[PDB]
Amino acid sequence: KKAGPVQVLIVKDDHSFELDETALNRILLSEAVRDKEVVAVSVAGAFRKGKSFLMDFMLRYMYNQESVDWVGDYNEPLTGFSWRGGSERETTGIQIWSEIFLINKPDGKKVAVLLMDTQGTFDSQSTLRDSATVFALSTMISSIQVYNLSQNVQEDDLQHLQLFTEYGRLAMEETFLKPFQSLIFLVRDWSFPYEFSYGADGGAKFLEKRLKVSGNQHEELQNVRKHIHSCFTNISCFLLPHPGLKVATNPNFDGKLKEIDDEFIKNLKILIPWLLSPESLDIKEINGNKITCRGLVEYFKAYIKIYQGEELPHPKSMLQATAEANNLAAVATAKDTYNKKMEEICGGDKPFLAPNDLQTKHLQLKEESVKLFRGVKKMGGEEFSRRYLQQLESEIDELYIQYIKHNDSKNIFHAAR
Amino acid sequence: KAGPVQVLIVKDDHSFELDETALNRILLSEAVRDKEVVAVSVAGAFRKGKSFLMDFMLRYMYNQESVDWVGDYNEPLTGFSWRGGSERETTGIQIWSEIFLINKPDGKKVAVLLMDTQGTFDSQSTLRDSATVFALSTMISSIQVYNLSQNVQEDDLQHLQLFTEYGRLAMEETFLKPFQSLIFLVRDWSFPYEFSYGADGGAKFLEKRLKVSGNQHEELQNVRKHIHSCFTNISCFLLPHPGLKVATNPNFDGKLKEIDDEFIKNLKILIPWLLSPESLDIKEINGNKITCRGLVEYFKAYIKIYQGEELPHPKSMLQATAEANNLAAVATAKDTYNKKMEEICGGDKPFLAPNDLQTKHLQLKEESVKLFRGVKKMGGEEFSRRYLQQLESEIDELYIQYIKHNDSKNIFHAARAAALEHH
Ligand SMILES: Nc1nc2c(ncn2[C@@H]2O[C@H](COP(=O)(O)OP(=O)(O)NP(=O)(O)O)[C@@H](O)[C@H]2O)c(=O)[nH]1
Ligand SMILES: Nc1nc2c(ncn2[C@@H]2O[C@H](COP(=O)(O)OP(=O)(O)NP(=O)(O)O)[C@@H](O)[C@H]2O)c(=O)[nH]1
Ligand SMILES: [Mg+2]
Ligand SMILES: [Mg+2]
């Protein structure tokens, strides 16, 4: 009866994902909201950075919109989505709030507002596929994604965003429009207001310089930025002050405003409506169509269904992915070398060779391809490269069988006359 | 006067060069030439307090015989350049001009080198820029302080694996571990009620964070196993937040009077812990202890490798995955063409009229192209366009060879036809 967080996407110990359809259906398919267009707000990013903490202040705003003091009473504990200190991850999978909010757009549109809290990336229990799936899904479902970052916007942040969004793209319909809508770079604990002011305007100037594409820029840097711009219709940045050392280090801290830095609260009171004001709420769109709560449930099911199978390629650790590419490239190089040299010997316009001599040449050329494959430095491991070396040897054996038949025909076809 | 010396330069065109004259001036002096060397380096993400830390290491190295080495509380912090702001400061690799001569417990007189490095992941650097600095600083130092913020996350572990693997590949083959001491320094640790500030809380924390289990997922296991196999001594120190003045006040100067006391307390444990003569390990490479002169030779050799050898250069996660996806698809699509052409014009198959053979090839080539296009790949058709072009070009080359094999089955086809046509 009382409102609370609802586990909607479950991530199990075996790294499998399961959707709680009953709960999702309960919330988004009720008669009161099912036919309404939907605004979905999500927060995502690294674990332990205050994502759920933030969402709970968004809840205070949603519940007390017409009040000037929505931020709460100063002795009131912060509740909603579960948050706490400690070095271990808290939120898992994807949670939504059980109460859908009905908000009047300035035109008169009665839209429904969904709030989505997510499992943090880069925890020690999770595989990269786990983190990417949760990040992609929230981005594919939300119309406003708050990318929660610590201290700065680093190049590895941009490359992770790129990886995660591209993974989302893969499971989506082909489209001629931008795949996603609003992205907010929220920088927590910004330490340089004297370089860029706290808030949206300092954020805007900061992010502008961060994502700017220039002709002098190395292609690797250009491309990640181009990808990001291509993915989102609106991109903004908000620079938030540190909430104070007590918020971060006191195990008894409760979310009470009286224990939070004043300049934080001041910028917080600007941040939330800036994200969530009736003016700012963009209705979810997928490939050119405004999605209702009913439609969102459908896409949520279809998307997770794709991530549950093996139709998509999955993201892998940095060393593992480079390693595969290293080996796949080496296998192709070694095989093409063997092949080119065999054609010089038993191509169609070359004379028939005695079988034993063909075999002797094959064995020499094969061994040279094996040596070539082995001499290329690859990440990561001669033991990672075993499966690929073995594939190379067997694929070359298969090619040689074709070459025997080709060689034999030069003798056979002539005998038949 | 002593000051920081720029030794490794990263050019604005992303190539690498060593300032050999600067290096020789320092490490080839008659005083230190043949001294066994200890090299202390700090590496990690930009703007995290690396240079700042090293300047406190400088104070210790200069005032060991003093009661209070940490300094007067009203004295500014100098040495390696540091500042606030969100833009990176340190570039390439710099070292301190003064080599410190210290006596080890066993009575050796070793030379001590301090090395400050360019922070990783700035927006000016390619991944290869960041990887090369990190790797070299690891390959040169006997003690690598890995400087992190707030936590040891999984992306930090994967970056360390990526960077150390890149270093390892440019090293002489060995059966021993490639490196020596690694310290996970966690800046702004927020949970002393869970793991204490300092080396003991850090030890217990990192023990759980890096523990290998044969039951956890392969990729979690393998990053951990890689890190353990790379270093002979791995440690962890949890440092408190220095206070908001240090992090946020533009007028902050490094004066201890403006730094949180808890940080100072732990800083005064950290530095002697890192730099105590008992624990200062002498640089070894491939089982041999290295002198100062010998360190320079290795620096030049290592640098040369990154300049001119075939190495698997680090790529962004998307880039790497996308290449693998495309390479596999090309291979598969190409193999499908080959197999099906062999059913049509393999050596044990009859001659085909050049026009029949042409239309089979055109049919099968299109089937392979569509096979290639049908497979889901990171990331995009644009990324794949060059690979699709490569596939089509390679299939065209196979077709040319198939034409030659087919002709050899009936060389006289055209000539006999022209003769029978006249008759
Ligand atoms: N330094 C800092 N700490 C913050 C900030 N906001 C909240 N915290 C603290 O961060 C800790 C984690 O809060 P939480 O909201 O649970 O973070 P989370 O991102 O949801 N974690 P998880 O990924 O594990 O779900 C709490 O101790 C909270 O007080 C902030 O802006 N800066
Ligand atoms: N939050 C926090 N800030 C710190 C800490 N130590 C130093 N700082 C602040 O960090 C800022 C950057 O210092 P600096 O030593 O230049 O960092 P760096 O890692 O060398 N930067 P770069 O990689 O760009 O050379 C300074 O404003 C300094 O006051 C710390 O432990 N925590
Ligand atoms: Mg959370
Ligand atoms: Mg620096």
From Swiss-Prot, chain A:
User: Which residues are noted in the entry as GTP-binding?
Assistant: R48, K49, G50, K51, S52, F53, R188, D189, V247
Any one of the GO BP annotations: protein homooligomerization
- Report the outcome of A132P: In SPG3; changed endoplasmic reticulum tubular network organization; endoplasmic reticulum and Golgi morphology are affected
Which one of the record's GO molecular function terms can you name?
Answer: identical protein binding
Kindly list the GO CC terms recorded for this protein.
axon; endoplasmic reticulum; endoplasmic reticulum membrane; endoplasmic reticulum tubular network; endoplasmic reticulum tubular network membrane; Golgi apparatus; Golgi cis cisterna membrane; Golgi membrane
UniProt: Mg(2+) binding residues: S52
Give start and end of each GB1/RHD3-type G domain: 35-280
Effect noted on mutating N411T: In SPG3; changed endoplasmic reticulum tubular network membrane organization
Q: How is it modified after translation?
A: Phosphorylated. Phosphorylation, by different kinases, of the N-terminal hypervariable region (HVR) regulates the ATL1-mediated membrane tethering step.
> Which residues point to the Cytoplasmic side?
1-417
Effect of altering R210C? In SPG3; decreased GTPase-dependent fusogenic activity; changed endoplasmic reticulum tubular network organization; endoplasmic reticulum and Golgi morphology are affected
Q: Which residues form a coiled coil?
A: 383-410
Outcome of swapping H414P: Changed endoplasmic reticulum tubular network membrane organization
Consequence of changing T133P: Changed endoplasmic reticulum tubular network organization. Endoplasmic reticulum and Golgi morphology are affected
Localization recorded for this chain is:
Endoplasmic reticulum membrane; Golgi apparatus membrane; Cell projection, Axon
Residues noted as binding GDP in the record, renumbered to the chain: R48, K49, G50, K51, S52, F53, Q119, R188, D189, V247, N250
Region of interest (Linker), ranges: 410-417
Q: What does this protein do?
A: Atlastin-1 (ATL1) is a membrane-anchored GTPase that mediates the GTP-dependent fusion of endoplasmic reticulum (ER) membranes, maintaining the continuous ER network. It facilitates the formation of three-way junctions where ER tubules intersect. Two atlastin-1 on neighboring ER tubules bind GTP and form loose homodimers through the GB1/RHD3-type G domains and 3HB regions. Upon GTP hydrolysis, the 3HB regions tighten, pulling the membranes together to drive their fusion. After fusion, the homodimer disassembles upon release of inorganic phosphate (Pi).
The disease tied to this protein in UniProt is: Spastic paraplegia 3, autosomal dominant: A form of spastic paraplegia, a neurodegenerative disorder characterized by a slow, gradual, progressive weakness and spasticity of the lower limbs. Rate of progression and the severity of symptoms are quite variable. Initial symptoms may include difficulty with balance, weakness and stiffness in the legs, muscle spasms, and dragging the toes when walking. In some forms of the disorder, bladder symptoms (such as incontinence) may appear, or the weakness and stiffness may spread to other parts of the body.
Subunit-structure text: Monomeric and homodimeric. The homodimer, transiently formed by two molecules on opposing membranes, is the active form mediating ER membrane fusion. Interacts with REEP1, REEP5, RTN3 and RTN4 (via the transmembrane region); these proteins are involved in endoplasmic reticulum tubular network organization. Interacts with ZFYVE27; both proteins are involved in endoplasmic reticulum tubular network organization. Interacts with ARL6IP1; both proteins are involved in endoplasmic reticulum tubular network organization.
- Please identify the protein, giving its name as recorded: Atlastin-1
Provide the species name: Homo sapiens (Human)
Query: What is the gene name?
Result: ATL1
Give the residues of the full protein shown.
30 to 446 of 558
